[PDB]
């Protein structure tokens, strides 16, 4: 059977980067022809494997990570980055083997009144381990005073909204990202 | 408490960028519409941005500036730590905002009527400004000059009196001498060894550089005066000051309109490509397409697609009221626009390079944090736009674009004609700018009492600018407030510093552009070295001190007047030869009514 790549790429709703979702790909044959012969993608950057030799290859299982970041934040979805998204939202291992795919979604993910649905984590104690996921909305304590539930001075909410307006620049427009991880069932 | 401040500054950058964008986009809909519904959205979104800035102002003042070690984080806290207009009471702030809005209104809504024809009533723009720029009748110009200062000037007199005392009450509460010291604080750098600059140092540097401008201006004043006597015989003394209503505009700020009366060699063809582009079928999009090509030739990036779609590059060609003042908008979020009712003229072609120069500055420092996305000082932004119009106005560039004929001979007289037109605009405004800001500095400092505001105003006009009033004014008039920048609460010393900056930039870029001829014939086109040399300062924004940003391009830690004199050096020697049988200088005692 064909692997359901349309359920992640052509998905209607895409998650925020802080709460990115993962989908495991088990016994099914892959079809990377769908991914390459399209001008729909903005990046399509592979690490550890090539964008062509993957057709005649087999893996134990494939993991697909999906989320949404701004244009300037796409650069952080790569091994060895230290931005806000890479450190507090989604980190890739140094020995990552896969491909990162992203495309512009200004017409569907940016509304005139401002789409504040897509969020990201701005404050967190220490950085995330590779493939770690944090959905805690606990008040970040930046000082020595206990926050005691309420925000205020030195106590900020960890999640902030992107705020995608359709008149923004390309560096501030919404981009849907799909990270395909390869682990060593799935063949071409 | 340094890491406690870094997280605080990040909660601001990711929250202010959204509120400023909503306020900027709201104010765009007003200058692009002009309705009552859109004027409220500008004020509604404006108070929310102000109220957010006030919360972050006081909550940033709890962070002791001395406790910060990393200096990039240091300058960001001082930017937020501003009480602003809120240090006044709720009644003082409403009255201060009431007079500031009332003054801007009477300036834009004030209209004078002709006593000879009472049905003919004209406001400043385009009514009175067209008279002061084209009319050759002494009484008609005297009427427009005096009616503007006797009608709308006297109404601003009681409002400007309270404006001085209320604005001083704000600055003195924020550890400043007066409101003039508050404006001079834009050039203050304090913390970096070898690049510091005090607020009092500005007064010393502006006056030191102005002494070297006196010789060039005195010869220009003597040359213009000789030509003006032929235009207004039996009205000007060959040894006295120039009447204020004969200078080319309402205030004498620019002598550009005197070119038809002061042209050195009128027989030579004028370089006005206005009719050329009209015949070549040029629209506003063609003007900006060529301006875009100019910045690409030096290595800078192109214009965003949102610029070519959301900007207002032409007249409101449908049903909407619009202010046509050319402005360059940096709304943030990568949204860069230009509002300009462009017409198929040469003056709009050069202005398109100026306004797009502002955008290239905004695009460069976009990677900097929010509080650092601005010019080095108040004069850096206008200087960047002016160096583009300097290169775009050279005959070498106009011929390469296609606006001048390829067989246009550039004689030594065509260059003196060009430099003279430049001097009427560039060097002609320097004594006016300095004298104006010097008068407000003294008023704010408390050196000019109220009972001699206008008396001391014209004593400086005669001595510094060399301009005498045509009719006597008591303290009931308020001629300085009759200018936009004075009655609309804007500092004016920025135009003096930007003038010296643009020629330091031009000389520095033309050296990187490997130019060899005169400085006024330089075009920094194709020069990736000059573009990289300029981009190295545009990317800095307000992170590095302006003394350091200026040094990254010109190699100097302070403003210098030598590049300004080198630009007009061929013209300065020509004026001395023309004034060999004329009187260079002016007597501060002659008046057209003694
Ligand atoms: C550096 O920037 C300048 C503009 O500031 C460029 O000069 C102009 O470049 C264009 C494009 O190559 C030339 O256009 C072509 O001109 C010929 C002759 O008129 C015409 O047959 C073509 O159809 C096209 O219009 C343009 O003439 C030229 N301006 C001149 C020579 O006055 C320059 O190319 C830039 N780059 C380089 C590598 O120099
Ligand atoms: C101007 O504003 C009115 C509401 O005040 C709106 O109906 C109209 O569409 C606006 N026009 C343009 C061109 O934005
Ligand atoms: Cl005046
Ligand atoms: Na005239
Ligand atoms: Zn400008």
XYZ file of N, CA and C in Angstrom, chain B residues 315-554:
720
model
N -1.233 59.476 -7.753
C -2.354 60.233 -7.229
C -3.498 59.277 -6.892
N -4.310 59.595 -5.875
C -5.541 58.823 -5.656
C -6.445 58.877 -6.876
N -6.268 57.922 -7.789
C -6.952 57.950 -9.076
C -8.390 57.453 -8.979
N -9.023 57.648 -7.824
C -10.426 57.287 -7.657
C -11.069 58.145 -6.575
N -12.043 57.590 -5.859
C -12.754 58.348 -4.848
C -12.177 58.206 -3.456
N -11.247 59.091 -3.100
C -10.618 59.083 -1.785
C -9.798 60.356 -1.632
N -9.806 60.919 -0.426
C -9.016 62.103 -0.118
C -7.656 61.654 0.390
N -6.598 62.352 -0.018
C -5.233 61.895 0.246
C -4.329 63.101 0.462
N -3.485 63.026 1.489
C -2.371 63.958 1.646
C -1.262 63.539 0.688
N -0.828 64.466 -0.163
C 0.148 64.174 -1.205
C 1.587 64.487 -0.801
N 1.859 64.645 0.487
C 3.225 64.897 0.932
C 4.049 63.622 0.804
N 5.147 63.631 0.045
C 5.920 62.398 -0.177
C 6.549 61.892 1.113
N 6.121 60.705 1.543
C 6.611 60.074 2.758
C 6.978 58.627 2.463
N 7.984 58.127 3.177
C 8.437 56.747 3.055
C 8.047 55.999 4.322
N 7.196 54.986 4.174
C 6.600 54.286 5.303
C 7.344 52.984 5.564
N 7.695 52.754 6.829
C 8.272 51.495 7.305
C 7.334 50.938 8.371
N 6.292 50.236 7.925
C 5.281 49.709 8.834
C 5.780 48.547 9.684
N 6.948 47.987 9.377
C 7.417 46.803 10.064
C 6.875 45.538 9.432
N 7.233 44.407 10.042
C 6.832 43.088 9.547
C 7.248 42.870 8.094
N 8.324 43.526 7.667
C 8.752 43.448 6.285
C 7.889 44.205 5.304
N 6.991 45.059 5.787
C 6.087 45.828 4.938
C 6.667 47.227 4.764
N 7.157 47.516 3.563
C 7.741 48.809 3.238
C 6.933 49.439 2.114
N 6.512 50.686 2.314
C 5.664 51.377 1.355
C 6.158 52.805 1.172
N 5.651 53.450 0.124
C 5.927 54.854 -0.161
C 4.618 55.518 -0.559
N 4.282 56.621 0.106
C 3.098 57.406 -0.219
C 3.544 58.667 -0.947
N 3.128 58.807 -2.204
C 3.559 59.936 -3.016
C 2.647 60.059 -4.225
N 2.080 61.251 -4.422
C 1.260 61.538 -5.599
C 2.201 61.954 -6.724
N 2.858 60.954 -7.306
C 3.898 61.211 -8.289
C 3.308 61.768 -9.578
N 3.961 62.796 -10.113
C 3.630 63.372 -11.405
C 4.814 63.207 -12.346
N 4.522 63.212 -13.645
C 5.553 63.020 -14.659
C 6.404 64.281 -14.749
N 7.260 64.494 -13.750
C 8.155 65.641 -13.705
C 9.540 65.175 -13.279
N 10.524 66.063 -13.447
C 11.882 65.747 -13.016
C 12.023 65.799 -11.501
N 11.301 66.708 -10.842
C 11.388 66.814 -9.390
C 10.847 65.572 -8.696
N 9.842 64.920 -9.283
C 9.351 63.664 -8.728
C 10.273 62.496 -9.049
N 11.031 62.581 -10.145
C 11.982 61.521 -10.460
C 13.110 61.472 -9.437
N 13.619 62.636 -9.029
C 14.678 62.664 -8.026
C 14.135 62.330 -6.644
N 12.905 62.758 -6.350
C 12.309 62.449 -5.054
C 12.056 60.956 -4.894
N 11.763 60.255 -5.993
C 11.571 58.810 -5.917
C 12.837 58.107 -5.446
N 14.005 58.607 -5.855
C 15.256 58.054 -5.348
C 15.465 58.387 -3.877
N 15.015 59.563 -3.437
C 15.150 59.926 -2.031
C 14.293 59.030 -1.148
N 13.011 58.888 -1.488
C 12.108 58.098 -0.656
C 12.468 56.618 -0.684
N 12.878 56.103 -1.845
C 13.339 54.719 -1.905
C 14.655 54.536 -1.158
N 15.443 55.604 -1.024
C 16.628 55.530 -0.187
C 16.285 55.289 1.271
N 15.181 55.880 1.740
C 14.710 55.601 3.094
C 14.345 54.131 3.253
N 13.740 53.538 2.222
C 13.325 52.142 2.301
C 14.538 51.221 2.345
N 15.560 51.517 1.535
C 16.781 50.720 1.574
C 17.446 50.783 2.943
N 17.354 51.930 3.621
C 17.832 52.013 4.997
C 16.995 51.127 5.914
N 15.672 51.143 5.736
C 14.795 50.344 6.586
C 14.994 48.853 6.347
N 15.205 48.454 5.089
C 15.416 47.040 4.794
C 16.730 46.530 5.371
N 17.725 47.407 5.519
C 19.045 46.959 5.947
C 19.051 46.570 7.420
N 18.530 47.440 8.288
C 18.525 47.179 9.722
C 17.305 46.386 10.189
N 16.651 45.646 9.292
C 15.490 44.860 9.691
C 15.859 43.703 10.612
N 17.100 43.219 10.548
C 17.531 42.130 11.415
C 17.810 42.584 12.841
N 17.995 43.883 13.061
C 18.227 44.402 14.397
C 16.957 44.283 15.235
N 17.088 44.288 16.563
C 15.896 44.282 17.423
C 15.035 45.517 17.193
N 13.820 45.460 17.743
C 12.803 46.459 17.428
C 13.252 47.867 17.806
N 13.736 48.046 19.036
C 14.133 49.374 19.498
C 15.363 49.910 18.778
N 16.033 49.091 17.971
C 17.229 49.507 17.254
C 16.998 49.694 15.761
N 15.766 49.511 15.280
C 15.454 49.679 13.861
C 15.117 51.146 13.609
N 16.167 51.940 13.422
C 16.044 53.365 13.148
C 17.410 53.855 12.690
N 17.435 55.056 12.125
C 18.688 55.658 11.710
C 19.621 55.895 12.885
N 20.889 56.150 12.551
C 21.891 56.403 13.583
C 21.508 57.604 14.439
N 21.174 58.723 13.800
C 20.586 59.864 14.490
C 19.443 60.401 13.631
N 18.883 61.540 14.042
C 17.764 62.123 13.312
C 18.157 62.612 11.925
N 19.444 62.849 11.683
C 19.900 63.359 10.406
C 20.400 62.290 9.455
N 20.618 61.079 9.968
C 21.128 60.003 9.125
C 20.106 59.564 8.081
N 18.826 59.501 8.457
C 17.806 59.016 7.529
C 17.660 59.941 6.324
N 17.494 61.244 6.569
C 17.371 62.192 5.466
C 18.644 62.271 4.635
N 19.803 62.033 5.253
C 21.054 62.086 4.504
C 21.160 60.921 3.531
N 20.648 59.751 3.915
C 20.706 58.592 3.030
C 19.868 58.826 1.781
N 18.680 59.412 1.942
C 17.851 59.706 0.788
C 18.421 60.791 -0.103
N 19.195 61.713 0.472
C 19.709 62.833 -0.308
C 20.893 62.428 -1.176
N 21.748 61.527 -0.685
C 22.876 61.075 -1.490
C 22.415 60.319 -2.727
N 21.209 59.747 -2.694
C 20.671 59.099 -3.884
C 20.251 60.131 -4.921
N 19.566 61.190 -4.486
C 19.182 62.250 -5.412
C 20.393 63.022 -5.920
N 21.482 63.055 -5.148
C 22.710 63.682 -5.628
C 23.290 62.915 -6.809
N 23.345 61.587 -6.702
C 23.854 60.780 -7.804
C 22.866 60.735 -8.962
N 21.564 60.751 -8.665
C 20.546 60.656 -9.703
C 20.362 61.954 -10.478
N 20.866 63.075 -9.963
C 20.727 64.365 -10.627
C 21.916 64.723 -11.509
N 22.983 63.932 -11.485
C 24.145 64.235 -12.304
C 23.812 64.029 -13.780
N 24.351 64.865 -14.672
C 24.093 64.664 -16.107
C 24.572 63.320 -16.623
N 25.622 62.753 -16.024
C 26.092 61.438 -16.446
C 25.034 60.371 -16.194
N 24.296 60.489 -15.089
C 23.244 59.522 -14.804
C 21.995 59.768 -15.640
N 21.636 61.035 -15.860
C 20.446 61.332 -16.651
C 20.627 60.919 -18.107
N 21.836 61.084 -18.648
C 22.098 60.638 -20.012
C 22.073 59.118 -20.108
N 22.584 58.433 -19.082
C 22.594 56.974 -19.102
C 21.191 56.401 -18.958
N 20.300 57.111 -18.266
C 18.928 56.640 -18.118
C 18.129 56.878 -19.396
N 18.417 57.960 -20.114
C 17.678 58.312 -21.307
C 16.877 59.590 -21.211
N 17.041 60.365 -20.140
C 16.296 61.605 -19.970
C 16.972 62.801 -20.627
N 18.294 62.776 -20.764
C 19.032 63.798 -21.491
C 19.503 63.253 -22.831
N 19.623 64.152 -23.804
C 20.093 63.754 -25.121
C 21.546 63.294 -25.028
N 21.930 62.259 -25.780
C 23.322 61.782 -25.712
C 24.349 62.790 -26.197
N 23.952 63.770 -27.009
C 24.862 64.801 -27.494
C 24.766 66.095 -26.690
N 24.424 66.000 -25.408
C 24.370 67.168 -24.536
C 25.786 67.491 -24.073
N 26.302 68.645 -24.486
C 27.642 69.058 -24.092
C 27.617 69.666 -22.696
N 28.491 69.166 -21.824
C 28.582 69.621 -20.437
C 29.713 70.641 -20.360
N 29.375 71.904 -20.603
C 30.349 72.981 -20.564
C 30.673 73.360 -19.121
N 31.691 74.212 -18.968
C 32.027 74.733 -17.650
C 30.984 75.718 -17.140
N 30.147 76.252 -18.028
C 29.063 77.140 -17.631
C 27.803 76.381 -17.243
N 27.551 75.229 -17.870
C 26.432 74.390 -17.455
C 26.645 73.826 -16.057
N 27.900 73.592 -15.669
C 28.189 73.093 -14.330
C 28.061 74.182 -13.273
N 28.416 75.424 -13.610
C 28.198 76.532 -12.684
C 26.708 76.821 -12.534
N 25.950 76.701 -13.628
C 24.497 76.810 -13.538
C 23.926 75.746 -12.609
N 24.420 74.511 -12.722
C 23.919 73.426 -11.885
C 24.307 73.629 -10.426
N 25.568 73.987 -10.171
C 26.005 74.206 -8.795
C 25.280 75.388 -8.165
N 24.994 76.424 -8.958
C 24.260 77.568 -8.428
C 22.847 77.167 -8.024
N 22.193 76.327 -8.830
C 20.868 75.847 -8.454
C 20.943 74.975 -7.210
N 21.999 74.166 -7.097
C 22.180 73.361 -5.895
C 22.462 74.239 -4.683
N 23.260 75.294 -4.860
C 23.603 76.154 -3.733
C 22.399 76.939 -3.231
N 21.502 77.345 -4.134
C 20.294 78.049 -3.712
C 19.434 77.185 -2.799
N 19.501 75.866 -2.961
C 18.741 74.930 -2.146
C 19.544 74.367 -0.983
N 20.802 73.999 -1.219
C 21.597 73.330 -0.193
C 22.223 74.343 0.758
N 23.105 75.198 0.238
C 23.792 76.151 1.103
C 22.898 77.319 1.502
N 21.803 77.553 0.774
C 20.925 78.658 1.112
C 20.112 78.418 2.366
N 19.873 77.154 2.709
C 19.061 76.814 3.870
C 19.870 76.671 5.152
N 21.205 76.683 5.067
C 22.014 76.470 6.267
C 21.899 77.607 7.277
N 22.070 78.883 6.908
C 21.862 79.947 7.903
C 20.433 80.031 8.404
N 19.450 79.728 7.553
C 18.062 79.721 8.000
C 17.820 78.625 9.029
N 18.359 77.429 8.784
C 18.155 76.313 9.703
C 18.837 76.570 11.042
N 20.093 77.025 11.009
C 20.822 77.272 12.248
C 20.176 78.387 13.059
N 19.844 79.503 12.403
C 19.260 80.635 13.116
C 17.918 80.267 13.736
N 17.113 79.474 13.026
C 15.816 79.072 13.558
C 15.976 78.223 14.813
N 16.797 77.173 14.736
C 16.990 76.306 15.892
C 17.733 77.024 17.012
N 18.604 77.977 16.669
C 19.281 78.763 17.695
C 18.291 79.636 18.456
N 17.297 80.187 17.755
C 16.295 81.020 18.412
C 15.432 80.205 19.367
N 15.004 79.013 18.944
C 14.213 78.162 19.828
C 15.047 77.618 20.981
N 16.331 77.340 20.743
C 17.208 76.917 21.830
C 17.299 77.990 22.908
N 17.446 79.253 22.500
C 17.534 80.337 23.474
C 16.206 80.557 24.187
N 15.091 80.430 23.464
C 13.779 80.602 24.087
C 13.536 79.517 25.129
N 13.837 78.265 24.776
C 13.683 77.172 25.732
C 14.665 77.308 26.889
N 15.913 77.684 26.596
C 16.908 77.860 27.647
C 16.578 79.032 28.563
N 15.714 79.944 28.128
C 15.353 81.093 28.932
C 16.198 82.325 28.722
N 16.857 82.453 27.572
C 17.685 83.613 27.278
C 16.942 84.702 26.516
N 15.756 84.408 25.993
C 14.951 85.396 25.278
C 13.625 85.576 26.007
N 13.423 86.690 26.706
C 12.150 86.905 27.401
C 10.996 87.057 26.421
N 9.782 86.900 26.958
C 8.585 86.957 26.124
C 8.385 88.335 25.507
N 8.785 89.394 26.211
C 8.571 90.749 25.715
C 9.523 91.134 24.589
N 10.400 90.227 24.156
C 11.293 90.505 23.037
C 11.554 89.233 22.234
N 10.517 88.411 22.060
C 10.637 87.220 21.223
C 10.859 87.598 19.763
N 9.957 88.409 19.203
C 10.085 88.799 17.803
C 11.184 89.831 17.596
N 11.478 90.637 18.617
C 12.569 91.599 18.510
C 13.909 90.887 18.372
N 14.140 89.861 19.195
C 15.360 89.073 19.080
C 15.323 88.141 17.876
N 14.127 87.769 17.415
C 14.009 86.895 16.252
C 14.571 87.567 15.005
N 14.212 88.833 14.784
C 14.682 89.549 13.605
C 16.078 90.132 13.776
N 16.529 90.345 15.016
C 17.929 90.703 15.224
C 18.853 89.577 14.780
N 18.425 88.326 14.960
C 19.212 87.190 14.493
C 19.044 86.973 12.994
N 17.841 87.227 12.469
C 17.626 87.151 11.026
C 18.547 88.108 10.284
N 18.709 89.325 10.808
C 19.576 90.302 10.161
C 21.042 89.906 10.278
N 21.456 89.428 11.451
C 22.871 89.169 11.692
C 23.311 87.829 11.113
N 22.524 86.778 11.333
C 22.912 85.432 10.926
C 22.513 85.178 9.479
N 21.215 85.279 9.191
C 20.730 84.955 7.855
C 20.972 86.103 6.878
N 21.055 87.332 7.370
C 21.169 88.472 6.477
C 19.867 88.790 5.777
N 18.748 88.672 6.487
C 17.422 88.891 5.930
C 16.681 89.872 6.826
N 16.105 90.903 6.218
C 15.387 91.951 6.932
C 13.901 91.813 6.631
N 13.072 92.140 7.628
C 11.633 92.052 7.424
C 11.142 93.247 6.606
N 10.161 93.038 5.721
C 9.664 94.163 4.915
C 8.792 95.131 5.694
N 8.033 94.650 6.675
C 7.181 95.505 7.498
C 7.435 95.191 8.968
N 7.352 96.175 9.864
C 7.718 95.928 11.264
C 6.708 95.043 11.977
N 7.226 94.158 12.825
C 6.426 93.234 13.615
C 6.732 93.442 15.091
N 5.685 93.600 15.894
C 5.839 93.712 17.337
C 5.847 92.303 17.935
N 5.660 92.192 19.247
C 5.579 90.882 19.878
C 4.210 90.232 19.709
N 3.261 90.919 19.065
C 1.961 90.316 18.792
C 2.048 89.282 17.676
N 2.940 89.490 16.711
C 3.127 88.522 15.645
C 3.907 87.320 16.173
N 3.954 86.262 15.361
C 4.704 85.061 15.709
C 5.184 84.416 14.406
N 6.126 85.094 13.754
C 6.630 84.621 12.468
C 7.301 83.250 12.525
N 8.121 82.913 13.532
C 8.682 81.551 13.568
C 7.631 80.455 13.589
N 6.510 80.669 14.281
C 5.463 79.653 14.315
C 4.765 79.496 12.971
N 4.911 80.467 12.068
C 4.315 80.367 10.741
C 4.992 79.322 9.864
N 6.054 78.682 10.345
C 6.692 77.576 9.651
C 6.147 76.258 10.192
N 6.105 75.247 9.321
C 5.502 73.969 9.689
C 6.222 73.326 10.868
N 7.551 73.231 10.793
C 8.295 72.482 11.801
C 8.196 73.119 13.180
N 7.976 74.431 13.247
C 7.909 75.107 14.537
C 6.549 74.898 15.191
N 5.472 75.061 14.421
C 4.125 74.928 14.961
C 3.652 73.483 15.051
N 4.402 72.531 14.494
C 4.034 71.122 14.543
C 4.951 70.297 15.437
N 5.767 70.947 16.268
C 6.589 70.274 17.275
C 7.574 69.289 16.641
N 8.463 69.833 15.815
C 9.528 69.064 15.191
C 10.851 69.780 15.396
N 11.881 69.018 15.758
C 13.220 69.581 15.818
C 13.658 69.985 14.415
N 14.497 71.016 14.341
C 14.934 71.545 13.059
C 16.427 71.413 12.808
N 17.232 71.156 13.841
C 18.669 70.990 13.657
C 19.016 69.749 12.851
N 18.048 68.852 12.632
C 18.312 67.657 11.840
C 18.658 68.006 10.399
N 18.113 69.107 9.878
C 18.399 69.502 8.507
C 19.789 70.100 8.353
N 20.381 70.603 9.437
C 21.757 71.077 9.375
C 22.736 69.911 9.403
N 22.517 68.957 10.310
C 23.419 67.816 10.408
C 23.306 66.915 9.184
N 22.085 66.719 8.674
C 21.910 65.881 7.491
C 22.595 66.483 6.272
N 22.666 67.814 6.199
C 23.324 68.451 5.064
C 24.817 68.159 5.062
N 25.463 68.238 6.228
C 26.879 67.895 6.293
C 27.098 66.394 6.157
N 26.141 65.582 6.619
C 26.281 64.134 6.505
C 26.239 63.679 5.051
N 25.317 64.234 4.258
C 25.121 63.746 2.896
C 26.341 63.983 2.019
N 27.118 65.026 2.301
C 28.327 65.278 1.530
C 29.534 64.518 2.057
N 29.573 64.232 3.360
C 30.561 63.288 3.866
C 30.308 61.895 3.306
N 29.035 61.505 3.200
C 28.697 60.223 2.591
C 29.058 60.212 1.112
N 28.701 61.276 0.389
C 28.973 61.323 -1.045
C 30.469 61.252 -1.322
N 31.259 62.074 -0.628
C 32.708 62.028 -0.809
C 33.273 60.659 -0.455
N 32.749 60.032 0.601
C 33.244 58.718 0.995
C 32.855 57.649 -0.017
N 31.643 57.737 -0.572
C 31.206 56.739 -1.543
C 31.877 56.943 -2.895
N 32.070 58.200 -3.307
C 32.724 58.459 -4.585
C 34.192 58.048 -4.557
N 34.817 58.061 -3.377
C 36.150 57.480 -3.252
C 36.093 55.965 -3.394
N 35.108 55.329 -2.753
C 34.906 53.898 -2.946
C 34.425 53.595 -4.357
N 33.681 54.519 -4.968
C 33.290 54.388 -6.364
C 34.413 54.764 -7.317
N 35.586 55.124 -6.790
C 36.765 55.434 -7.598
C 36.529 56.605 -8.550
N 35.683 57.549 -8.147
C 35.432 58.726 -8.964
C 36.669 59.617 -9.008
N 36.861 60.280 -10.151
C 38.049 61.086 -10.388
C 37.764 62.542 -10.733
N 36.578 62.861 -11.243
C 36.245 64.217 -11.609
C 35.770 65.028 -10.420
N 35.065 66.128 -10.684
C 34.504 66.920 -9.585
C 33.479 66.112 -8.803
N 33.293 66.503 -7.539
C 32.409 65.748 -6.656
C 30.956 65.805 -7.116
N 30.539 66.913 -7.729
C 29.155 67.060 -8.162
C 28.827 66.255 -9.413
N 29.832 65.755 -10.129
C 29.623 64.920 -11.302
C 29.719 63.435 -10.979
N 29.677 63.070 -9.700
C 29.880 61.691 -9.279
C 28.569 60.918 -9.252
N 28.620 59.689 -9.759
C 27.502 58.755 -9.711
C 28.023 57.448 -9.139
N 27.470 57.032 -8.000
C 27.967 55.854 -7.297
C 27.360 54.590 -7.890
N 26.797 54.702 -9.090
C 26.232 53.541 -9.756
C 27.337 52.550 -10.116
N 26.966 51.268 -10.110
C 27.797 50.099 -10.400
C 28.807 49.775 -9.306
N 28.908 50.617 -8.283
C 29.988 50.497 -7.302
C 29.544 49.572 -6.180
N 29.825 48.277 -6.351
C 29.552 47.321 -5.284
C 30.384 47.609 -4.038
N 31.572 48.197 -4.205
C 32.377 48.583 -3.049
C 31.706 49.697 -2.254
N 31.211 50.727 -2.944
C 30.507 51.799 -2.249
C 29.198 51.296 -1.656
N 28.518 50.388 -2.360
C 27.298 49.817 -1.817
C 27.564 48.973 -0.586
N 28.626 48.164 -0.621
C 29.002 47.393 0.559
C 29.487 48.308 1.676
N 30.201 49.380 1.323
C 30.679 50.325 2.329
C 29.521 51.072 2.978
N 28.487 51.394 2.198
C 27.312 52.058 2.751
C 26.427 51.082 3.518
N 26.261 49.864 2.997
C 25.439 48.869 3.679
C 26.007 48.508 5.045
N 27.330 48.583 5.208
C 27.936 48.287 6.501
C 27.494 49.259 7.586
N 27.001 50.437 7.212
C 26.452 51.380 8.177
C 24.932 51.354 8.235
N 24.263 51.051 7.119
C 22.806 50.973 7.136
C 22.325 49.805 7.986
N 23.053 48.686 7.959
C 22.686 47.527 8.765
C 22.827 47.789 10.257
N 23.660 48.757 10.649
C 23.863 49.025 12.068
C 22.597 49.543 12.731
N 21.785 50.302 12.003
C 20.602 50.886 12.609
C 21.008 51.866 13.691
N 20.412 51.712 14.871
C 20.759 52.516 16.035
C 21.542 51.721 17.072
N 22.035 50.535 16.704
C 22.807 49.722 17.639
C 24.150 50.371 17.948
N 24.912 50.672 16.933
C 26.170 51.349 17.187
C 25.944 52.856 17.251
N 26.766 53.575 18.018
C 26.622 55.033 18.082
C 26.790 55.662 16.707
N 26.149 56.820 16.525
C 26.213 57.497 15.234
C 27.638 57.910 14.892
N 28.457 58.198 15.907
C 29.860 58.509 15.659
C 30.588 57.304 15.074
N 30.245 56.100 15.538
C 30.850 54.894 14.984
C 30.279 54.574 13.608
N 28.963 54.729 13.437
C 28.350 54.465 12.140
C 28.865 55.433 11.082
N 29.063 56.698 11.459
C 29.643 57.663 10.531
C 31.084 57.302 10.193
N 31.826 56.771 11.168
C 33.217 56.403 10.926
C 33.333 55.191 10.010
N 32.319 54.322 9.996
C 32.378 53.124 9.165
C 32.331 53.436 7.676
N 31.918 54.645 7.298
C 31.783 55.037 5.900
C 32.719 56.189 5.540
N 32.748 57.235 6.366
C 33.584 58.396 6.076
C 34.936 58.354 6.783
